[PDB]
Design a protein around this ligand. Structure first.
Ligand code: NA
Length: 157
């Protein structure tokens, strides 16, 4: 009743390549809140602002035992470079095959350039300690977003 999104069951066991060379899975995060924020491109203004915003709020997320994962389809190397430059203290998922993106249905289409163009739509999701997606933000505007996500986490937790 509380889920706003149902993920394919296999989603939770997908090996997610992280910045730093390790993997995680959503199931591995059982027992605590997880924020998953999808962004279109490493090292761009909006995605950097969003990452830095979450990073600045990390201790507030820590208070709730929550973990953050940023997700794009950039490579692990790109993620490493991005994370190092910005000083992120949470992992970035290299979703190169967009398996996680598709599971969360963040690959969206736009009619532009006389074509049908797919891309990551900036989106964020709150996952409960039992892996339920209890809140979603789509077509995210970066300004104030990490604040809003933190507030929602605090409301839910
Ligand atoms: Na979780």
């Amino acid at each position: 009743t509380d889920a706003v999104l149902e993920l394919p069951a296999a989603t939770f066991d997908l090996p997610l390549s992280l910045s730093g060379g390790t993997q995680t899975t959503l199931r591995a995060h059982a027992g605590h809140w997880l924020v998953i924020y999808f962004y279109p491109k490493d090292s761009t203004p909006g995605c950097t602002t969003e990452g830095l915003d979450f990073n600045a709020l990390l201790p507030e997320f820590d208070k709730a035992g929550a973990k953050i994962l940023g997700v794009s389809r950039d490579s692990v190397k790109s993620h490493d470079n991005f994370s190092a430059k910005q000083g992120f203290a949470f992992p970035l998922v290299s979703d190169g095959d967009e398996a996680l993106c598709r599971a969360f249905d963040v690959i969206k289409e736009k009619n532009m350039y006389g074509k049908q163009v797919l891309g990551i739509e900036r989106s964020t999701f709150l996952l409960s300690p039992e892996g339920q997606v209890v809140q979603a933000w789509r077509k995210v505007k970066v300004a104030g977003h990490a604040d809003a996500v933190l507030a929602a986490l605090k409301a839910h937790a």
